[PDB]
Design a protein around this ligand. Structure first.
Ligand SMILES: Nc1ccnc2c1ncn2[C@@H]1O[C@H](CO)[C@@H](O)[C@H]1O
Ligand SMILES: Nc1ccnc2c1ncn2[C@@H]1O[C@H](CO)[C@@H](O)[C@H]1O
Ligand SMILES: Nc1ccnc2c1ncn2[C@@H]1O[C@H](CO)[C@@H](O)[C@H]1O
Ligand SMILES: Nc1ccnc2c1ncn2[C@@H]1O[C@H](CO)[C@@H](O)[C@H]1O
Ligand SMILES: Nc1ccnc2c1ncn2[C@@H]1O[C@H](CO)[C@@H](O)[C@H]1O
Ligand SMILES: Nc1ccnc2c1ncn2[C@@H]1O[C@H](CO)[C@@H](O)[C@H]1O
Lengths: 247, 244, 252, 248, 248, 245
């Protein structure tokens, strides 16, 4: 069975995610479920799409990426299942949540989830995430052919992007464990930096500047980022996922 | 072959404790699968955990042990109980009623008190029976230890009381991720005149953004919500009538 | 076959990062079991993580890799160390002392520095060695890569210092039970020897919480054997406003 | 000379209690006229009494004391307040907001707390301040005791909150005419047929529609109301107070 | 000032009757208002007419009888004011409510109430009872000449009667405090009675028969009545007003 | 000059009868003030009315006539009695004991039987002596007719019996409060059968819906629920047993 990677905005504070996992193990006995996160802010599709970008790279090809942020649950908004160029399967509401992950790994095939046999038979309109997305992810992980899921659709719904302009960018995400600030400006779109978020030393890593000192760097994904060594730059500057311009 | 262990407690995820319980389980039952239901039950809150455990029997396989401990009585006269339900799933929890709703949903086919040291973690620490009795017994059962080896038959596990609806009810739980409000009134008991006009909806998106709505939640109980908003935040509303 | 990987970090659960580490581990070691110890270690806090890792060797099987990273030194001269203990468990962590208490509890039978690129994630990102060195090495070891292939022998992993308790008994609040508000000290209960006169009042010495009235104060030996103070069904930290490293005196 | 005393409470008419209050008043103020407004306020229901007291200032002379007590706080820290309004009428009630609507209609020219024992019934029984403070003070004021002798100035009497109507028009059934079954809302009529949730013909009076027929109108106070001609709309629709949307 | 005797179907459960009394005291300071009753069943003109029959006899000549049961309020149905042979004044809607009272005391003069000066200047169509009937009763009690009220009308509107026939009649009213049954058959139209409502002992008063025993008598008004001694005959027999009664 | 007439009966307010009595009184005594005590006494219930009349003498002026009639004996050998008490108030009622508690509280200074037709309503209807004897006599006395003109001296008005407490009288029907015949001075918490009852100054010293024990306005031990009906909760009716442990 495929490994199921699991993301949602439902949380860990009660039984709901656990019930989804139990349903998956019911459908696919012996399945491995790795949580990516369930702390996506409520209704926040863009945040989840950002969190899912690298998931295809760092998971095996024998994977189902199960993700649901679904304020459209129980409406005309269907669930989409996708095979990418890596050969991984992806299941999510067709509201664009898979946008960045699909840009990174490609769309080799995409169908709408309409076959009741891959659903949890009484799909509750308020919890399609469990009864359609999770159940379909488990059925696919068990080896159900993607073609059985429903009709081909040309392209999954896609989120829009306001890229950086040559430089002017934006704070895309904040490292909430540490206070580090990430931008959408790729570092290759270039030692010190004059930037508005002041002179920022360009560093390999955090510890090349004194403790509490400011620093600029390329994060794990390759995008320009700002930080304080052993400190929270967000806390100091009060910045929220804002501006950014490299002079 | 080993059962899947479903794991609930009020101990948390902020340090090693739950991880140590899981390591102990894997020591007792190598190759065991442990699915967390949640460990964010508010401290000492048995009723909250019982509410969270109600649907767990339905949505887990029959080859399951439900390991749950909310145990302010740990290291006292209050024993640990192990149960086989009508689905054939095993359940392990302190005999303080925490299994009440789960047992109402799935039945009591057999129940024994956990007294045999061979299913315990030999130096059971009085302050952490949850690990040394409940978790160790759940792992031994998952490994295939017969329930009869666990200790003496007891007629009924201790049960929590309920104040049902009369329509008058209470807010049973709040969806803490979203702010949705759940009641104990079954929907089987269009608009609603209610004290907490609410449009009766299939789902959240049948009303404008920030709009109020009434519906039947996943479990079938009347619930109130704001579309893409927190009704709890708006109304400041658990334990807090539908006019006909 | 594969070892169980026990996983600790200060990176969190609020986004994809820990999940990406787990996916990398499953890529390196298919069919691996990953048990989270915790990922809520306060940022940069090596001492807190070392305290959290002390009992991990005892309560995990011998066929285990303990993968832990709290790494404000990531991408610097500070290497990653891999250790075999007397229980035969493997441990992988930055060589900044994070493994100190775990190693005191289970011993150092062998320790090497992680320098071989074949056990790393080939483009190791300097800001995330925790993923690209620590996690990848933990997965390769769990898959059965010999520890000797990891790099050069080093005599002793870097060790954290300790300020133990003294007899006048004066120690400190080591940790606080953040779920419950219970207060833990570094004073072993066996140093004591029913009620306690202590500065943190008279504290009844109890087997467990429920031997005192609800909201009542109590003293006891916690799961690890160290003197602890609590309120029955209450938060002693909340009542007394105590935070970790605060002084504690046991009057004799 | 003496003021007319208008008398409201939730104590009832089924036994001697209201009569004993009236006797006490006549003891304090011989020759006083006591007109009952009502004593059938539902028990502990301050909001209902405040609604019932709104028009009382308009339809009584200026030489009046409005004596009202709904007092689940009797014998506690909750004092009794005495008020002079812009009409020059006096008002006596527990300072729990019961005078809210009456005061909004007639104004607060002066307000003091009743603390002087000389205007009280000397052994004030904690369970019946309504008699021993409110009624006795109303009688002493009706006899001509200066309001300033009653106790200390207080800036504003305690006031009940209101959830008014909103233009989307959504309001509530404020009161029901319990003699007839007519339904009153908080929507002023100043805010022909009506599309409403509770088609309603808009009428001058009840008899412009067939017997048992539905009708919408502006009641005596000017607020939108619904009724059945020679019938109980409450009985037909099962509507209770605090339950109205007017579609425009 | 005249004594005002006050009857309506509005009730005592809220402020309405009290507001009418306050209006009367505004118009006529120092006026005495005696309630006859305000528990007339809603819209029930016949019941009120029955209740008003003896009112002229048992009140002084210096009286205004103010009565309103007014489902026709705010319509073409005016208010009538009457002087009877006793010299008492009467004010009521011209829908027949004064029928029995007028049969007992006579019509010496009757006018329609049309002069705005005896009305409450903004007469609310839904509450003429207050703004016309009560205000006119108060103005008359203050000494306003009846001729100022409006135009002479020959006869007030009168209710019809289905009298008893030689003997057969009906249950006219039930004593709702006690369960006693009253008929329209005068006792002088007749020791024991064979009657359908059984042999009924003919008694001076209730206590001439055993407790719970049946009895026949002439009530205070002189009409044949049936009762149970210390019991409710209505409760036993389930009889409601208008039900036939036959004396054999 | 005329006395205030305080008026109690079991006849009711649902029709004209009480109003006709008041009109008769105003005919006899012009300018008289009539204060209703109550007319909702349960039918034929003399004991209930006697309980309701106990405090009436205290809280009314001395220049008063207390007119009360609960009269299932109307038009029989049972006469009407008129009384002057030690406060100097006059009282008129059927001589069936209805004045018992009021007289115990205020005393009997003089008592006569009402037999003089000049203080009656000349055609006294046997079924309504309450109007034609009791009310008319109350009005004539209020007008200043000497009590001695009313009829013959009688030594003691008929008196109701009492079963006192030994070492539930009424229920507050507006609120559900329970009153006993045990004086509070025959005594912080109470062990009682009607549970531990907190002894309170007033209702609001206990949580909403909470039980409480106290001394009512008259000084007798009483039980209540704060903002609730204790009668409704416990289904207790008057005369039911109570014991203080
Ligand atoms: N009040 C709400 C409004 C809109 N969506 C909600 C609400 N509550 C829960 N949800 C959504 O329901 C989904 C369940 O499939 C979750 O992904 C969540 O985003
Ligand atoms: N201060 C405390 C008082 C009562 N129970 C506690 C306390 N701290 C931890 N516990 C309980 O100990 C249990 C360990 O088995 C936990 O389930 C938890 O509820
Ligand atoms: N701003 C920062 C300063 C120092 N260390 C950081 C910072 N942000 C993340 N880290 C560290 O990077 C490590 C990644 O291997 C994490 O363990 C974390 O402690
Ligand atoms: N059981 C009760 C609880 C609270 N208030 C009460 C209770 N019984 C009577 N009262 C109040 O006492 C007041 C007497 O001043 C009345 O207005 C009434 O509202
Ligand atoms: N719904 C109604 C229909 C007809 N008459 C009414 C209605 N409500 C009140 N009234 C009448 O209005 C009169 C007010 O003058 C009252 O006498 C009463 O009978
Ligand atoms: N059916 C009845 C039996 C006995 N007494 C009655 C009955 N009906 C009325 N009465 C009494 O007649 C009295 C009139 O004086 C009232 O006080 C009342 O108690």
């Amino acid at each position: 069975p495929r490994v199921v990677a699991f993301l949602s905005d439902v949380g860990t504070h009660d039984e709901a995610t656990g019930l989804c996992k139990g349903l998956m193990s019911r459908i696919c006995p012996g399945v491995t479920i790795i949580d990516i996160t369930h702390q996506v802010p409520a209704f926040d599709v863009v945040e989840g799409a950002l969190m899912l970008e690298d998931v295809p790279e760092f998971f095996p090809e024998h994977t189902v990426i199960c993700a649901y942020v679904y304020p459209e649950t129980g409406s005309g908004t269907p669930t989409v299942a996708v095979r990418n160029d890596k050969g991984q399967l992806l299941v999510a509401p067709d509201n664009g949540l898979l946008t960045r992950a699909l840009d990174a790994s490609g769309v080799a095939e995409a169908r709408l989830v309409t076959n009741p046999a891959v659903m949890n038979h009484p799909p509750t309109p308020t919890w399609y995430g469990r009864d359609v997305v999770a159940a379909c992810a488990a059925h696919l992980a068990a080896g159900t052919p993607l073609a059985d899921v429903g009709p081909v659709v040309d392209d999954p719904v896609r989120l829009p992007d306001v890229p950086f302009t040559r430089l002017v960018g934006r704070v895309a995400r904040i490292d909430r464990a540490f206070g580090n600030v990430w931008t959408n400006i790729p570092s290759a779109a270039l030692v010190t930096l004059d930037a508005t978020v002041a002179r920022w030393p360009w560093c390999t890593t955090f510890s090349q500047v004194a403790t509490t000192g400011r620093l600029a760097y390329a994060n794990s994904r390759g995008r320009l980022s700002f930080a304080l060594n052993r400190g929270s730059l967000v806390a100091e500057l009060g910045v929220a996922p804002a501006p950014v311009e490299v002079h």
